[PDB]
Amino acid sequence: TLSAGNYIIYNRVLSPRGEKLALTYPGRQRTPVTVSPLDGSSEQAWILRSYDSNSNTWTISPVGSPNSQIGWGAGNVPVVLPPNNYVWTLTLTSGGYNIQDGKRTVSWSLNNATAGEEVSIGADATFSGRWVIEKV
Amino acid sequence: LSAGNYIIYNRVLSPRGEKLALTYPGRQRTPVTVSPLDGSSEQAWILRSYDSNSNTWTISPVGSPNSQIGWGAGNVPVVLPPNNYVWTLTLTSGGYNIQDGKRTVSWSLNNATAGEEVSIGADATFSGRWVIEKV
Ligand SMILES: CC(=O)N[C@@H]1[C@@H](O[C@@H]2O[C@@H](C)[C@@H](O)[C@@H](O)[C@@H]2O)[C@H](O[C@@H]2O[C@H](CO)[C@H](O)[C@H](O[C@]3(C(=O)O)C[C@H](O)[C@@H](NC(C)=O)[C@H]([C@H](O)[C@H](O)CO)O3)[C@H]2O)[C@@H](CO)O[C@H]1O
Secondary structure, rough: OOOOEEEEEEEEEOOOOOOOOOEEOOOOOOOOOOOEEEOOOOHOOOEEEEEOOOOOEEEEEOOOOOOOEEEEEOOOOOEEOOOOOOOEEEEEEOOOOEEEOOOOOEEEEEOOOOOOOOEEOOOOOOOOOEEEEEEE | OOOOEEEEEEOEOOOOOOEEEHHHHHHHHOEEEEEEEOOOOOHHHEEEEOOOOOOOOEEOOOOOOOOOEEEEEEOOEEEEOOOOEEEEEEEEEEEEEEEOOOOOOOEEEEOOOOOEOOEOOOOOOOOOOEEEOOO
């Protein structure tokens, strides 16, 4: 069962060249969060903190800006923001992690699963709507 | 793509994040599956150009290098005594589409799990695309 700590978060769907596509901090706030080939950089490392354990909700912070939190951006993409109790449900399904809002109305997915793609917040897509979360 | 020895794995990882590589089941006439990439000879395949004008290739396990992957009953691939069984290997912007010679069906995975049989049929988003790497 997931515990609080530092993680990489990558998609079940590889890039066309076979690279694991890891959730990537874009270096500043209010800017879409993307995926890029797994490379061990700090931009790919995220702090998961348990918010409401009874609802399975978590805050997600970049290791490089550990006080900020991933929130829900305009145009339905995640962006990093000053803290304000922005939380996500992290459900381990038989198909991997479903990353959803608190109310489980939307899921994070990738439209094409390519290097540099923005993460989409919306309908639960087969395969690209599932994630792998591994401890650093 | 040049002739030689390759691993062939799906774009869709297993639920735990493992690359799922085309795996020889150890004998002929039996469904070919995927399993986590592990470097075993059962995951190594010989690609030989057949008709470079139609982009077709034969695919043979290294553990029985004269046998060829053919189209099994129930729409799964199986390894067979040779008979010019060929597959079109088209590199798309989404990776390799592995199709019959007539380009009517594609190989894909239904759930993308360890030990799953490869399906021959409709082209599925993501699991119908493959990565082919020299080994
Ligand atoms: C624990 C708690 O209640 N936290 C509050 C936040 O909600 C938690 O985090 C979000 C990401 C979801 O997972 C929630 O289910 C969860 O409880 C809350 O964040 C706001 O949550 C609301 C829903 O309750 C909504 O998702 C907000 O996202 C949007 C929106 O869809 O309305 C997304 C838009 O891009 C954004 N547009 C802007 C900022 O221009 C809008 C916009 O803020 C509102 O429409 C106008 O107010 O929000 C999400 O931000 C947080 C702020 O409300 O409060 C926490 O207490």
